[PDB]
Design a protein around this nucleic acid. Structure first.
Ligand SMILES: *OP(=O)(O)OC[C@H]1O[C@@H](n2cnc3c(N)ncnc32)[C@H](O)[C@@H]1O
Length: 637
DNA sequence: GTCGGAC
DNA sequence: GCTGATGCGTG
DNA sequence: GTCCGACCACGCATCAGC
């Protein structure tokens, strides 16, 4: 009846009576908005999952076709990841559309959104148009993403304005948040799947209206219901790990049920799969705290690239995020015959694409690999060569190897694939358990221009079932242990207002090193992680009395982002980083290493405040240039 | 990519 | 046609 | 331990404004 008072977090929720729309009718967007309100209100993930599951139960019973758009709206996704749809709507475009919808000036909404750290609250504060539809709003989002070419931005603003003028109550909050990419719900992919599993299990799809069953957890005890939903949730999470595509799972799910889902949606070449991720470990003692045999392989500094070889012969390349990278690696497609034995007909490979110097026969840093083109690269115009480092086999000649331990996968990988030094090399492995040999292999990886070591079990918990544990592998880098990472002491010269969880305080900071020759502070990087919430409020207060309207004459930031609050240089912070990079924007140590480029920090994080040190006692630009030239990858050239 | 927080 | 701004996908 | 959302550098690809 009334969608304004819709409450999907009601005790003894009924998918039919407690709904706010009629069967066969389109799902209103206000129902989705009010649910986002209830989800954002609470903090327990188990409460969030059941609240959204109450939505999908009503959707799967009243409006089955609206399940797919509701799922994507809750994920703030536009579709399958290999399709590559992107909104192309920045903050400025959204704020410009907001100022045009609400009738304010751009400078009024730009300062208000930066002060609150959220565009949704700004967007909400004529004749009433028809109410917004969940599938209609999702279609408008996709219409925005598909607008390309000249004068397309003005066409995106028109659609965004068209949504905002039809919003009621809380709809403008979540449309603006979705368009900006910060839904800020506290509930993401993993909770959406678990809530989808709970919805199909409780209210099964495919029932002729009115559905004969609404709450299948009625004739169960509290213990058996939790075990039943957990078992039903793992079937969906595992199938989605091999097919992360809702456009494929939902239709099969709606016509064949959850129990029969793995029989139709199965891992196959051409369809990207979720890759195995790694868990950061402190030292080798934390590694040895895992009682089983493992292998230590180099951590190559490149990009994840899973190779898909089809039966007919077509080859597709997918990224860590299941994005299509086929047109980006034309040199890899041509090298497919030179890496497989003639008996190979189809395979899913797990490799790391690393930039390779053909003259010296040496690995190039990650910056060089990022200089390759993306959009429809011609095979001849490729300038930065790449060497593949395969470390896992997933699919081979029709048979899937997800249920096979890594020891078997490593055997069939080196057996059916042939090495080619400079283009296809297995990651150097070391299958021992001595703390002395392992500590030496880790130092050898850095000497061989690698980030560190990967640790993977060989038999005990060595499957590729990412749904059981998505961080089953361990990564051990030199900057994870204390006293070994490059520790720099830098000066805080500026601060940026925080957004989201950091709204009301500072989310980032601008750091600078001391150029002893120019008697000036040179910005080196920004800092936005490493401090606890208590420290971050302590910084926001201790530096609130240091704000300067103008920058000091001895501060140089060059192409860096102008800080929101200029800060009087006095605070000295200890910062840890994994590497030092040649920056195209930061002026720190410009001219000392490269004639035009400065130096910045890779993966910088806050450690602690240095009250003993003063700005002049901070890390000098000459020392920063010394650390860059003392890096193994730079010495190795 | 690193990281802290609430559960 | 060029250029600064910036979205976005890699890490 | 899981899940989530704060934040980082870098560089290709894109488009409003000129
Ligand atoms: O730090 P992180 O979680 O991104 O690490 C995981 C990624 O590291 C890359 N990588 C490099 N070398 C390897 C080996 N030998 N095994 C597995 N992964 C490896 C991958 O790109 C991975 O996603």
């Amino acid at each position: 009846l009334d969608p304004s008072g819709y409450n999907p977090a009601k005790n003894n929720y009924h998918p039919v009576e407690d709904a706010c729309w009629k069967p066969g009718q389109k799902v209103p967007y206000l129902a989705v908005a009010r649910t986002f309100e209830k989800i954002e209100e609470v903090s327990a993930r188990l409460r969030m999952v059941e609240t959204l599951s109450n939505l999908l139960r009503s959707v799967v019973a009243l409006s089955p076709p609206d399940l797919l758009p509701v799922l994507y709206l809750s994920l703030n996704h536009l579709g399958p990841p290999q399709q590559g749809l992107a909104l192309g709507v920045g903050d400025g475009v959204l704020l410009k559309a907001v100022a045009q919808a609400t009738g304010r000036q751009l400078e009024s909404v730009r300062a208000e959104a930066a002060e609150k750290g959220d565009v949704g609250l700004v967007a909400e504060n004529m004749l009433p148009p028809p109410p917004l539809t969940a599938s209609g709003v999702f279609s408008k989002f996709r219409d925005i993403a598909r607008l390309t070419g000249s004068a397309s931005t003005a066409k995106k603003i028109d659609i965004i304005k068209g949504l905002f003028v039809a919003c009621r109550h809380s709809e403008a909050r979540f449309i603006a948040r979705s368009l900006s990419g910060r839904l800020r719900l506290g509930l993401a992919e993993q909770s959406v799947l678990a809530a989808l599993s709970q919805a199909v299990s409780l209210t099964p799809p495919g029932q002729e209206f009115p559905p004969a069953m609404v709450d299948a957890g009625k004739g169960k005890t509290a213990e058996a219901r939790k075990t039943w939903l957990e078992e039903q949730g793992m079937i969906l999470k595992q199938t989605f790990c091999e097919v992360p595509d809702l456009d494929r799972i939902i239709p099969v799910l709606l016509e064949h049920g959850l129990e029969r889902l793995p029989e139709h949606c199965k891992l196959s070449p051409g369809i990207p799969l979720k890759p195995m991720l790694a868990h950061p470990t402190r030292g080798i003692s934390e590694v040895l705290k895992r009682e089983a045999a493992f292998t230590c392989e180099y951590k190559y500094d490149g990009q994840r690239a899973q190779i898909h070889a089809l039966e007919g012969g077509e080859v597709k390349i997918f990224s860590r995020n299941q994005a299509d990278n086929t047109g980006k690696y034309p040199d890899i497609i041509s090298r497919i015959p030179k890496i497989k034995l003639p008996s190979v007909t189809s395979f899913i490979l797990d490799t790391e694409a690393v930039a390779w110097d053909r003259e010296k026969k040496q690995i190039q840093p990650f910056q060089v690999l990022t200089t390759r083109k993306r959009k429809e690269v011609d095979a001849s115009e490729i300038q930065v060569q790449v060497c593949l480092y395969a470390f896992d086999l997933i699919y081979l000649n029709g048979e899937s190897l997800v249920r096979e331990p890594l020891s078997r996968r490593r055997q069939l990988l080196r057996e059916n694939f042939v090495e080619t030094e400079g283009e296809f090399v297995f990651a150097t492995s070391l299958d021992t358990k001595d703390i002395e040999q392992i500590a030496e292999f880790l130092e050898q990886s850095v000497k061989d221009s690698c980030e560190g070591l990967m640790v993977k079990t060989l038999d005990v918990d060595a499957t590729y079932e990412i749904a059981k544990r998505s961080h089953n592998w361990l990564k051990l880098k030199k900057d994870y242990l204390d006293g070994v990472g490059d520790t720099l002491d830098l000066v805080v010269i500026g601060a940026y207002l925080g957004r989201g969880k950091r709204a009301g305080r500072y989310g980032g900071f601008l750091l600078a090193s001391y150029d002893e020759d120019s008697e000036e502070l040179q910005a080196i990087c920004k800092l936005g992680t490493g401090f606890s919430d208590e420290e971050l409020e302590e910084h926001h207060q201790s530096l609130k009395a240091l704000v300067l309207p103008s920058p000091r004459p001895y501060v140089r930031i060059d192409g860096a982002v102008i800080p929101d609050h200029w800060l009087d240089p006095s605070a000295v912070w200890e910062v840890k980083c994994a590497d030092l990079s040649l920056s195209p924007i930061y002026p720190a140590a410009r001219g000392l290493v490269d004639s035009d480029k400065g130096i910045s920090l890779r993966f910088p994080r806050f450690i602690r405040v240095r009250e003993d040190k003063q700005p002049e006692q901070a890390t000098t630009s000459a020392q920063v240039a010394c650390l860059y030239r003392k890096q193994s990858q730079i010495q190795n050239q």
